[PDB]
Amino acid sequence: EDLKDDHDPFLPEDHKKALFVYQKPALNNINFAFKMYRQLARDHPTENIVISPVSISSALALLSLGAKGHTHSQIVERLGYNTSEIPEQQIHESFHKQLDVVDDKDRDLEFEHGNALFTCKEHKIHQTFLDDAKKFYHSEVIPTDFKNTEEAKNQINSYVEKSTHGKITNILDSVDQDAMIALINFIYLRANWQHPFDEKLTKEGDFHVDKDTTVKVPFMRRRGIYKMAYTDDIIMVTIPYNGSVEMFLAMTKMGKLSELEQNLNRERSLKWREIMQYQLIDLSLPKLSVSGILNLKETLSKLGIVDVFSNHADLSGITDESHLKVSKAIHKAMMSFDEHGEADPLMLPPHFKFDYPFIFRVQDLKTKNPLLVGRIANPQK
């Protein structure tokens, strides 16, 4: 052992970690995210998609607190929960914990979230629903007058503006004068890179919207070690944020993204997780500020959640109005990419440039819940 060094000086950093342990609520929310995104990707073929699956699941679980009978059990089941395995109050506790761990400010996270139910002023909301909506979901039930449509538009939008600190200024264009309950759910996420980008290295480049459409956007560029994988047909990278959150990105050749989106599930995700390795790469990301607005009635109905939006909804846990139903259900999510949320290598590293339509997934590493997923089809909205 006449070795020049007592340890191999070329060996890269060790990156082993313990096995990801999952709680059953997180697994249900993860599988619901896949189911919902695949359908959304079918129904909106060309646009940007930005949704928070855990926040949609949370809003419906809150709605189930005010539901009874088949209306209640259908929501719980279609969210992926089996009440023969999980007591119902552990579901509400799990969504409560997710709010607390994200709102923990010793955690460095720029994740603003909000959920509110706007109801008719002339009807009294049950106190037990008011109590649990505030306790478990930090959600307000706000009286409104929908017969005067224009004040509700300004009021709902101003509420969203206030709770997002002006980041989401508009969520509702108009509301029917016969509305009973309006579910309003919104998310803003700014990527707070664990390793920020240098603004000096940001350059304008081509983003290819489709086989014949190209737009000019600023591209951030950084050289570093990232967990990655690539073939001739796909590249994928995991980018850590601060505060125990990681963003996964995947990109295919032009026009093949749909083939990827319609094949996503957890089992295939875990297989790719084992293939990916930490490698030195050049990473190019478009500067970006993209929005997605979701009509939750049409989307959730295709997923089997129908009663709560129907003329036979049993929402007597909220109010004793005869035919109370959720008339409007909106989910708006915003995501922003900016810069701040050395000798030459022997070989030029592979350049992971995301200048083609790509999909993204933001995951809370403490809970494993999907905080945000979607598709960047055009970083210019």
Ligand X SMILES: C=CC1=C(C)/C(=C/c2[nH]c(/C=C3N=C(/C=C4\NC(=O)C(C)=C4C=C)C(C)=C\3CCC(=O)O)c(CCC(=O)O)c2C)NC1=O
Q: Which residues bind ligand X (CB under 6 A)?
A: 30, 33-34, 37, 227, 236, 238, 246, 248, 250, 260, 263-266, 268-269, 272-273, 276, 359-361, 363, 368, 370, 373
CB closer to ligand X out of 268 and 351: 268
Backbone angles phi, psi at 233, to 5 degrees: -115, -10
In the complex, minimum distance from the CB of residue 27 to ligand X, in angstroms, rounded to a whole number: 7
Token pair, residue 212, equals 């014949």
CB closer to ligand X out of 190 and 368: 368
In the complex, minimum distance from the CB of residue 368 to ligand X, in angstroms, rounded to a whole number: 5
Q: How far, rounded to the nearest angstrom, does the alpha carbon of residue 350 sit from its chain's CA centroid?
A: 29
CB closer to ligand X out of 40 and 180: 40
Residue 214: which residues within 8 A CB-CB, separation 6 or more? 206, 207, 208
Helices (H), 82-188: 88-103, 127-137, 149-163
In the complex, minimum distance from the CB of residue 173 to ligand X, in angstroms, rounded to a whole number: 27
Burial grade of 344 (CB within 10 A; 0-12, 13-18, 19 or more): exposed
- C-beta nearest to ligand X: residue: 269
Q: How far, rounded to the nearest angstrom, does the alpha carbon of residue 6 sit from its chain's CA centroid?
A: 47
Token pair, residue 123, equals 């009807």
> Which residue, among 31, 25, 55, 26, has the nearest Cα to 269 in the 3D structure?
31
What is the number of helices (H) and of strands (E) in the chain?
9, 14
CB closer to ligand X out of 53 and 317: 53
Cα–Cα distance, 376 to 14 (Å, whole number): 33
In the complex, minimum distance from the CB of residue 39 to ligand X, in angstroms, rounded to a whole number: 10
* Residue 221 contacts residue 202 (beta carbons within 8 Å): yes
In the complex, minimum distance from the CB of residue 261 to ligand X, in angstroms, rounded to a whole number: 7
CB closer to ligand X out of 33 and 184: 33
In the complex, minimum distance from the CB of residue 295 to ligand X, in angstroms, rounded to a whole number: 19
In the complex, minimum distance from the CB of residue 30 to ligand X, in angstroms, rounded to a whole number: 5
Residue 336: which residues within 8 A CB-CB, separation 6 or more? 188, 189, 190, 191, 288, 289
CB closer to ligand X out of 207 and 360: 360
CB closer to ligand X out of 47 and 314: 47
Token pair, residue 350, equals 């592979």
